């Protein structure tokens, strides 16, 4: 097989629900990231063979959101594009799909990653076409239905976290301590400039002014264990899961240029990392948060690695409960996990999230000179996906 | 690299808008086709490595429609799934994506295809979440916006068909004659049993009864040139494109089992066709209907074939105008094109359409003993995709 590398890795800041990125469509976040990713790779727009982007809340975004992001980015109309939906895994899975297509001999350069604007999701009327006839009906929150609700069990993803808290015996306190540690890591990383290299600014041009968004806004600086302990349960009576130990609803795009090592050499690109292996797996939807266990095991086996060999790990924090279960069973050294904070603090912009963690991983590997890295995350509907990277 | 084969190919009947399959969600049509494809292929569900399905109108369908179809088919939960949106080409692109993943060394057996229920598309309120504040707004038809409207030029796909008609001087009369020919061929094919081997019946459990849908209902038997000439332009004043010479809005699923030739031999499968090559291409969105010209050329070049070596062709009839343009420029022998009718008569269920013409092609190739086949179609947003088959 051809070897496959990451040439550049870029993301917008992660905006909070209804806040900083509320007026910026997902496809415009995506275009902002694409332009800057192409520029950071040091290639020309004409060098890209395909665009593959994750997006989950596609409702009313218009034909083929990936194609829209591409066009708005200045990429030639000649380049094909497609939009992938694997829920939370979308943005990570496009990167392994890119690797697969390159290994198949069909391209040398692919723009991958994902984009999401949860703040902009519509409401739906399911029976307006042919009519309600009589009686009240549901005005459906598309964000919940398309992104956050289990289609088999008829409950919120937060209930899948409670299921994991119950079965693995992970206490509210353990969940709150994990959340607090993520907040503290995120604050320290932001203030020490760890994200400065990876974040492309988004310029919001209104009728009257320009505003620049370039800082993650979701973290709660000065978080305390007492603050967390007082929070009410978010999903069920007497639940362990709360807004403080669950990831948020957020807006972001994150994009990587993926290439064959031989194309990168030819074009003078200095790659950030090699994509070593990857894997995807399914699990019972009721415990979807455990998906990364199987996906990580598959990818590691494929690579001929072990977990102990890993230098840095990004394991997406959909919920403390599930992150803890996964870490425990994979026996992670928690000092190597989400060293710049995770999604409890930073947010979870579902379509983008997988790509966002990989962006974060590859920049952290460069800065810390770490040789081997893992990114993996859980997927609503009962899946996991993972990618292993090696420094070039 | 590994050789890639099609082990089975099945579709539901194509229902008309608001009619026979109005009460059957896309994911249920998909599940129906998946179960029958796995059966026809002669494999176990546990031999399947991934499910990759096209679906365009995802709004309110719940998390990850491909996973839902996979789950409702009875496939084991350990199998991963993802949903692809490349508009009209979604269903065909999943097949070449499967071939790429297999060629990459990452799987041996993939369920691919597409599913769509256009009758069931919701209406949307885009600003219900944070408020309209004041003034009337749009109650958005999600089928139009997500499937049929150009995101760049702000007009219907039918206007892209007028554009081609104007550029190429394809007259109303020429479009109507092409339409009539498609209708006659579909009638002949339906009545002569050509679609019997490929159609899986859909069993609808109504309160009143149990009903079975197993026949394509869109064709209009006894269509006449005079009947076509009386129709009004559907998209612009004094236009050439009408309801009669455009494809319809339709509901269907079409699924294929794709495997390495090595695995097929190990499992005792007798394949239907080898996948020889494939391609995708982008064009200006305004002339999207021309996408197959470039896609087809790429595929044929990769294969080192020529157009005149083709024994059967399925070139999707999004509109008579664009089918006629692609056909003139690729120089097709029209007697080998859409021999069982095309989408003007049969319908165009967007996410499934590209898989549906591939199903139709492979069955037609076994019936007529043809050696080489091409499936190609246009994509809204200015793309094309194509697959080349050689009969085993
Ligand atoms: C949990 C959830 C319902 C909360 O949504 P919300 O009510 O809009 O959340 P908010 O961020 O507004 O938080 C509400 C209040 O909780 C409190 N809160 C949240 N995090 C806190 C923290 N670290 N410390 C103290 N208080 C906190 C605050 O009081 C906040 O009010 P404020 O913003 O005025 O201070 C939502 O984030 C959610 O659904 N998350 C899970 C997402 C998910 O399932 N993703 C898919 C994973 S597979
Ligand atoms: C053209 C379009 C708007 C028509 O929608 P519609 O009005 O719902 O179409 P209908 O099937 O109801 O047809 C309307 C009337 O036209 C007439 N008609 C359609 N096909 C006909 C034919 N072969 N002969 C005679 N009359 C015909 C009929 O009178 C019909 O009324 P009836 O069924 O009551 O007899 C719709 O099919 C469309 O938008 N098609 C294009 C889809 C598209 O763009 N797809 C994407 C491609 S990239």
Numbering used by the authors:
A (entry chain A), B (entry chain B): 1 to 392
Could you share sentences copied from the article?
Here, we present the crystal structure of C. acetobutylicum thiolase (CaTHL), a type II biosynthetic thiolase that catalyses the first step of n-butanol biosynthesis and condenses two acetyl-CoAs to acetoacetyl-CoA. We reveal that CaTHL, unlike other type II biosynthetic thiolases from aerobic bacteria, is regulated via modulation of a redox-switch, indicating that n-butanol production and the relevant metabolic fluxes in Clostridium are tightly regulated by thiolase. CaTHL consists of three domains: an N-terminal α/β domain (N-domain, residues 1–119 and 249–269), a loop domain (L-domain, residues 120–248), and a C-terminal α/β domain (C-domain, residues 270–392). The N- and C-domains form a typical five-layered fold (α–β–α–β–α) observed in other thiolase superfamily of proteins including peroxisomal degradative thiolase from Saccharomyces cerevisiae, β-ketoacyl synthase II from E. coli, and the biosynthetic thiolase from Zoogloea ramigera (ZrTHL)14151617181920.
Next, the crystal structure of the reduced form of CaTHL in complex with CoA was determined. The catalytic residues such as Cys88, Cys378 and His348 were observed to be located at the same positions as those of the corresponding residues of ZrTHL, indicating that the catalytic mechanism might be identical to that of ZrTHL. However, the CoA-binding mode of CaTHL was quite unique when compared with that of ZrTHL. In CaTHL, His218 residue, whose corresponding residue is Tyr218 in ZrTHL, is involved in the stabilization of pyrophosphate moiety of CoA, and Ser223 residue is located at the position of Ala223 in ZrTHL. Moreover, in CaTHL, Arg133 residue from the neighbouring polypeptide is involved in the stabilization of pyrophosphate moiety of CoA through hydrogen bond, whereas the corresponding Lys133 residue in ZrTHL has conformation distal from the bound CoA.
